[PDB]
Amino acid sequence: NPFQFYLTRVSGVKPKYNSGALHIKDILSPLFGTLVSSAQFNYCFDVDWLVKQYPPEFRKKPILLVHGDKREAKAHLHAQAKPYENISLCQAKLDIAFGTHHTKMMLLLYEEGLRVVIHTSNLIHADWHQKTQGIWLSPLYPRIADGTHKSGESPTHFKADLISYLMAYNAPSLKEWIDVIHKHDLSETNVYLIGSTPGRFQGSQKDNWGHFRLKKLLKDHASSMPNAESWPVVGQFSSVGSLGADESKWLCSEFKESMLTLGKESSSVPLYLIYPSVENVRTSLEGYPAGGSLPYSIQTAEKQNWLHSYFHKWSAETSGRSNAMPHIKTYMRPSPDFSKIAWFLVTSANLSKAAWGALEKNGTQLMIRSYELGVLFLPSAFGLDSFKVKQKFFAGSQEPMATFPVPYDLPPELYGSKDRPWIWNIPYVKAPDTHGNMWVP
Ligand SMILES: O=P(O)(O)c1ccc(Nc2c(-c3ccccc3)nc3ccccn23)cc1
């Protein structure tokens, strides 16, 4: 397949639903390359667990942890890392309040080349155990020969765009990785990078990041079709920020407007949001503890009850993962009958202004609080007008280079009248979960 989009392994499901899924130990195995060094961009790290995921023969190779922790949290991460002299740390600057470093990415330097992994899992055991998570695996990028002058650039501009993303950190450890990337040929890359970095972007930088980056790519590299107003937008996420007192403040104004863009010419578009209900969490493989990875607070939720009328249950029979709670985030543009999609994005970005950006200064400036990263699959980058949707995620299609593996069921199913969104800081004591327990925060 050309897409190289994988789910993580889920413990406990039938083997047929893990055939072609990847565990972290698979990604780091010597079969993927002879490791020289690596960078692990993430939010949360269990360092002892992380080192054990590397092959024994690679556990002393240099590792850079790129994180956003401050104050006592930074001290704790440093203390986790101090027993391993091969581990260095980069604290990503977060100079706007309430910002986070959420990007999940591995840079893997090998004797044979370079690989980039952009994915959705924290580097802790629980995120790779029984959750639905997404992975994009780059090709093995070969080194450009000493003395050869070539760009190594792809038609999607991925190499320069990944360097631009890393440049935003202004970090010496990441300039070293920028120089590694310069020395490699990334021209086979068929996805577009969509990043968020903290800042206030105007003018020539407005389109670099967040939802304006998405808009710009959709304007330049997608085509509008007849009855485009009938093609829904689907967003699927594991956390919800404060979106405002009604849908016009952000969600259905600037955010939906960027996501419905197609092509360069100048809304009734249905918007489906997929987010686990309480019942989804209760009956999940993990039970109520899965809700510790579904941060949606009651203080935020009670200020935006209008939002929950957009909410659809998690369902993933197609991948055997209805009970594997989602920590993947995805956004896509299906056709009215959900048989095709115009594009697909897998990203770290949840449904929040901090992640996607909020317009300021009379619509002239996009303000972003966090670091995020995802990859966009556009049909034009594969020589296609649209992607067919794969009927069964792990099955064998007649045209695998069309046929995009959407990991959950379409159409999404609206919450029922008795469903409620998972809210992680109130108790649930009416019905026990799959392990016999209640939820008492
Ligand atoms: O639907 P199928 O293809 O007929 C089918 C496939 C597998 C099984 N049994 C089964 C399971 C399992 C069964 C239920 C739920 C979770 C895991 N795990 C293993 C591992 C090795 C061998 C068998 N295993 C039964 C029927």
Numbering used by the authors: 162 to 427, 433 to 607
From the paper:
In the 1.56 Å data set collected from the TDP1 crystal soaked with 3b, electron density for the arylphosphonic acid headgroup was observed in the active site of both monomers of TDP1 in the asymmetric unit. Analysis of the binding mode of the arylphosphonic headgroup demonstrates that each of the oxygen atoms of the phosphonic acid is engaged in binding interactions with the signature HKN catalytic motifs of TDP1. The 01 oxygen atom hydrogen bonds directly to the side chain nitrogen atoms of the K265 and H263 (2.8 Å). The 04 oxygen atom is hydrogen bonded to the side chain nitrogen atom of K495 (3.0 Å) and is engaged in a water-mediated hydrogen bonding network with water 842 (2.8 Å) and the backbone carbonyl oxygen of S514 (2.6 Å). The 03 oxygen atom is hydrogen bonded to the side chain nitrogen atoms of the N283 (2.8 Å) and H493 (2.6 Å). Stabilizing hydrophobic interactions occur between the side chains of Y204 and P461 with the aryl moiety of 3b. When compared to the binding mode of 2b, the phosphonic acid headgroup of 3b superimposes closely with the carboxylate group of 2b (shift of 0.8 Å in distance) and the aryl moieties align closely with a slight rotation of the aryl moiety in 3b. Interactions of the vanadate phosphate mimetic and DNA 3′-phosphate group correspond closely to what we observed with the phosphonic acid in 3b.
Human tyrosyl-DNA phosphodiesterase 1 (TDP1) is a 608 amino acid DNA repair enzyme that processes 3′-DNA end-blocking lesions by hydrolyzing the 3′-phosphate esters. TDP1 is of importance because it can reverse stalled type I topoisomerase (TOP1)-DNA cleavage complexes (TOP1cc′s) by cleaving the phosphodiester bond between the TOP1 Y723 residue and the 3′-phosphate of its DNA substrate (Pommier, 2006; 2009). When acting on TOP1cc′s, the target phosphate ester bond nestles in a well-formed pocket that contains the signature “His-Lys-Asn” (HKN) catalytic residues. As we report herein, we have designed phosphonic acid-containing variants of our previously reported carboxylic acid-containing imidazopyrazine and imidazopyridine inhibitors and we have obtained crystal structures of the catalytic domain of TDP1 (148–608) complexed with a subset of these inhibitors.
